[PDB]
Design a binder for these strands. Structure first.
Lengths: 62, 80, 82, 162, 95, 63, 73, 81, 169, 83
RNA sequence: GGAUUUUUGGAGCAGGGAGAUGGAAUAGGAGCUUGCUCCGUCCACUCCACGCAUCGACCUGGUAUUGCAGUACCUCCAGGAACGGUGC
């Protein structure tokens, strides 16, 4: 419990709620749910979410 | 209905209380009473424009808190 | 539960609204969260006012302190009962 | 008997006569000082009367301390890295020890905030040009051996060993 | 008791907290000024006599001087908010 | 000090004990995810010890 | 809701200390359980030396910090 | 054995005489709001007729009319006439 | 003069500040024993004088034995036992030893006080017969040894010194 | 009822206490009477006035809502309410 | 049991002006490195308005008190002002 948070349940789940909050701030609009956010993270080698030269880079790093 | 009763049914929940003197106290609730005084443990407490100190437990008075940050994994409709 | 009664007789640090720190043996409290602190010391943060001056903490010894509850922000423990 | 946190936790913790936070360690015959950081920086003055401490060393970072009382110990050598761990000291009470040479007082110039010193009942007091060497060595001390410094002492401290 | 529960619902329907009632009626955001100058855009889950609030989807905007001060904002997902720090609740926010 | 004989013998023995212990763990049944991850993290620290002991064993043969 | 024990300070010349550093002096003429005072011959003294006699005032209790007895009480 | 001027009596005297009342402000040393008291109530909330703010720094008086100055702001009630 | 816990001090330098005087006195008297309190008053009756309250009587005797005429802030200080007791102090080998040259007047409580210092005493018998003689019995032999070593030549009522020997079968 | 601290404050009356008001002025004097809402009246007051100006007032009455804290005499440290 | 002395807060914010003054070792942008130029963040010194006046703590020299007490603080003169807060 110094290595995992409760939402992660020891390798069962990953918390992406915090990343979803940072993502709302980054897009500057609320037109985007948690489920809509997960569809973004199902992307692999296709069209990017934002322009890859913008501020999306700091978020992607984190 | 009073929402202090909503807050009193929180224990071992990791919140982040913003106090009235610009303080940010991130810790898990051990007890809230009817006067909104919150007793936390495992506290990461950051004063205004200061480094985050850590305390084993804190006991904030009720009027001095400004707002909470509750966990996202909280079903509030069952809590009300 | 009466949670503050668990914290009784400990060396406790109490944060006031103006930023002071009261380290005292927390003897008693009540409904308004007044405190009685034995051997209590207050700690004022001192603004530096320069680019190169450090920030210091001035400590006053007080003794038996009744702290009115409207001043109190939050209390933490420092030590076991001496 | 060696010193541990056990003798810290049981000893008298109180408010002294000069109204600071005090831990008492009288009459323990401690030869080496270690494991002091369990005091959790809640103290301003720690007594060490009647211990067999050979050297004043092993001092961890405690910021709130303003007085060390090392009365009647066996300090023959002194620690040098004391100012990095005791930054806000005001009194050092080194009475009744076995300091013999002038250079043995040389680490004491590193404490910037130092104001009061007592090196009484020491052989280092016995040698000539002692007190002026202390003033010329540690200038920030205002009270030396319960004698206030004077400007004639500062001048004849600056004059010698040029 | 029960007459106070009917009294509080009719009072929250017709009184000053109606907009908070309206914010729990059709689930629209309110813009809440706080005593530390933080604007809060978010829905209200529940309120009371004190305007204590339980809030969803909160965007807290505020203005920070580093020069020109910038509109640094954060997204608090779900929160509780004490009622004495609330300044102004405006039911329909423009943007 | 018998670096050639005693120290290498002790380091070889300590390695054998570490192999026996994480073998005893992989022999035992596991019942829930927390205690699985806990043992797998424990076996990681034992592997860190094994690698360090094996490091020292390899840098003790020049003399 | 207990009234303050200002029965000593009644009809005695006071020196109030209100919040904001304000300072008024005068003969205390009455009080309520909220410590709202009624001051007769009330003279307001500002940061400037000149003192405005304002006569008969009602001071709300929550602004009072202190009151000094300028008479012996 | 002494009789007391409780402050509601004197605020009601201000009401009866319709006297123009200067009101000081809590934690606001600059501004003083003066007006004719039409009425007041339990928490010392006042209503004022032809009220005006007086900022002592700018020495300017801004007219307001009939206001309801909330009671917790009041420090002192001074009669100008 | 009787031994007290508080040592009274005059002939000090009155030009120093009171808090510096209190820090310096706590420094100067931390050596002898545990200082529980110091009374330094700067009023015109009591300036230049201090009182140091100790926990034990022996440390006050050691302070009076050491600091006769100590140069302190440019003045040789004069320490005496204080005429009154404090507020705080007033608020707070064989088992059998044969004692000789014991004062006739000696009270039972006094004997317990002197002998008891080296722990628990089983019983003491004073001689109603050959006066100035007594038997002191200790519960533990170790205690007895300590008492015997220390007590011989003990000065109680300076006119006489006690002689203590181990009882013989 | 009445809390343990206000009972200690009532015990402190007749002795020299030290109030600090909300404006930081330090009023040290003999506590003549204290009240349930911490209204304190003190005689022989020595006021500090927040910039060092120690004056001596006689017979002050401090509103309890402005009291930051109350340094009570240490001889009340053994009171049976503190137990 | 959110309307003056305690718990639903009267709190938030900013440190005067100027000078071809000085620095961002590893951390500003633009004229698309390096060198140069411009602009919305500090500290040190100098000038106007040592920001101002106040009292407390404190350092040097001279000087007075030799006194048995449970303490906001304690002699006076002159210089310097490192600290605290009050009103503008």
């Amino acid at each position: 419990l110094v290595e995992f948070t409760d939402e992660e349940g020891y390798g069962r789940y990953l918390d992406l709620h915090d990343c979803y909050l940072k993502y709302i701030n980054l897009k500057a609009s609320e037109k985007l749910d948690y489920i809509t956010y997960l569809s973004i993270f199902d992307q692999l080698f296709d069209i990017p979410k934002e322009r890859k030269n913008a501020e999306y880079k700091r978020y992607l790093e984190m | 209905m009073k929402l202090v009763r909503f807050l009193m049914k929180l224990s071992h929940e990791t919140v982040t209380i913003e106090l009235k003197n610009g303080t940010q106290v991130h810790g898990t609730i051990t007890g809230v009473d009817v006067s909104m005084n919150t007793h936390l443990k495992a506290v990461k407490m950051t004063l205004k424009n200061r480094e985050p100190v850590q305390l084993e437990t804190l006991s904030i008075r009720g009027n001095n808190i400004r707002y909470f940050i509750l966990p996202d994994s909280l079903p509030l409709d069952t809590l009300l | 539960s009466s949670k503050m009664l668990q914290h009784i007789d400990y060396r406790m640090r109490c944060i006031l609204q103006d930023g002071r720190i009261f380290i005292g043996t927390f003897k008693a409290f009540d409904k308004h969260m007044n405190l009685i602190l034995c051997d209590c010391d207050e700690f004022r943060k001192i603004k530096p006012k320069n680019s190169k001056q450090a920030e210091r903490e001035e400590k006053r010894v007080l003794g038996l302190v009744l702290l009115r509850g409207e001043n109190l922000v939050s209390m933490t423990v420092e030590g076991p009962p001496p | 008997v060696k010193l541990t946190a056990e003798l810290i936790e049981q000893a008298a913790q109180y408010t002294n006569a000069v109204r600071d936070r005090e831990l008492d360690l009288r009459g323990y015959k401690i030869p080496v000082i270690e494991n002091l950081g369990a005091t959790l920086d809640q103290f301003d003055a720690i007594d060490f009367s009647d211990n067999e401490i050979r050297k004043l060393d092993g001092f961890p970072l405690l910021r709130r301390l303003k007085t060390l009382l090392v009365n009647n110990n066996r300090i023959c050598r002194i620690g040098e890295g004391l100012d990095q761990a005791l930054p806000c000291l005001t009194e050092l009470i080194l009475t009744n020890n076995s300091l013999v040479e002038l250079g043995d007082l040389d680490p004491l110039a590193s404490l910037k905030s130092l104001t009061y010193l007592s090196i009484l009942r020491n052989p280092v007091t016995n040698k000539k040009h002692y007190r002026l060497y202390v003033i010329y060595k540690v200038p920030q001390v205002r009270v030396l051996d319960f004698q206030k410094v004077k400007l004639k002492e500062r001048q004849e401290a600056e004059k010698m060993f040029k | 008791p029960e007459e106070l529960q009917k009294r509080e619902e009719e009072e929250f329907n017709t009184g000053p907290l109606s907009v908070l009632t309206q914010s729990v009626k059709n689930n629209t955001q309110v813009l809440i000024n706080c005593r530390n100058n933080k604007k809060l855009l978010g829905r209200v889950k529940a309120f009371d006599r004190h305007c204590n609030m339980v809030l969803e989807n909160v965007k807290e905007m505020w203005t920070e001087v580093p020069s020109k001060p910038v509109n640094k904002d954060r997204y608090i997902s779900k929160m509780f908010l004490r009622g004495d720090s609330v300044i102004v609740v405006l039911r329909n926010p423009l943007i | 000090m018998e670096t050639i004989l005693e120290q290498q013998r002790r380091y070889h023995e300590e390695k054998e004990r570490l192999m026996d212990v994480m073998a005893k763990e992989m022999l035992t049944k596991k019942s829930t995810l927390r205690d699985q991850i806990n043992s797998d993290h424990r076996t990681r620290a034992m592997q860190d010890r094994y690698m360090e002991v094996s490091g020292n064993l390899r840098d003790l043969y020049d003399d | 809701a207990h009234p303050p024990e200002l029965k000593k300070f009644m009809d005695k010349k006071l020196s109030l200390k209100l919040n904001g550093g304000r300072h008024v002096q005068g003969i205390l003429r009455g009080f309520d359980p909220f410590m709202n005072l009624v001051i007769d011959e009330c003279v307001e003294m500002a940061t400037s030396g000149q003192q405005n006699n304002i006569g008969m005032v009602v001071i709300r209790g929550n602004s009072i910090i202190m009151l000094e007895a300028l008479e012996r009480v | 054995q002494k009789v007391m001027v409780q402050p509601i009596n004197l605020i009601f005297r201000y009401l009866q005489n319709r006297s123009r009342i200067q009101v000081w402000l809590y934690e606001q040393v600059n501004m003083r709001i003066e007006g004719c008291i039409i009425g007041f109530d339990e928490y010392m909330n006042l209503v004022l007729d032809d009220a005006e703010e007086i900022h002592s720094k700018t020495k300017s008086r801004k007219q307001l009319g009939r206001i309801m100055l909330k009671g917790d702001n009041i420090t002192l009630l001074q009669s100008v006439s | 003069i009787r031994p007290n816990h508080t040592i009274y001090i005059n002939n000090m330098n009155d030009k120093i500040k009171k808090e510096e005087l209190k820090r310096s006195l706590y420094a100067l008297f931390s050596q002898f024993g545990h200082v529980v309190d110091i009374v330094a008053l700067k009023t015109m009756k009591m300036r230049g004088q201090a009182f140091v309250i100790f926990k034990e009587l022996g440390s006050s005797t050691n302070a009076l034995r050491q600091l006769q005429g100590f140069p302190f802030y440019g003045k040789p200080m004069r320490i005496q036992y204080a005429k009154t007791d404090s507020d705080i102090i007033s608020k707070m080998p064989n088992y059998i030893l044969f004692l000789n040259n014991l004062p006739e007047e000696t009270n039972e409580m006094m004997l317990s006080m002197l002998f008891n210092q080296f722990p628990g005493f089983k019983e003491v018998r004073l001689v109603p017969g050959r006066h100035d003689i007594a038997f002191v019995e200790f519960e533990n032999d170790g205690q007895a040894g300590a008492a015997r070593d220390a007590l011989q030549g003990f000065k109680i009522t300076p006119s006489h010194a006690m002689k203590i020997t181990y009882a013989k079968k | 009822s009445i809390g343990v601290p206000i009972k200690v404050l009532h015990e402190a009356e007749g002795h020299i206490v030290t109030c600090e008001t909300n404006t930081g002025e330090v009023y040290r004097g003999k506590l003549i009477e204290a009240e349930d809402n911490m209204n304190c009246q003190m005689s022989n007051i020595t006021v500090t006035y927040r910039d060092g100006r120690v004056a001596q007032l006689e017979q002050v009455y401090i509103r309890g809502s402005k009291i930051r804290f109350l340094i009570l005499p240490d001889m009340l440290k053994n009171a049976p309410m503190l137990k």
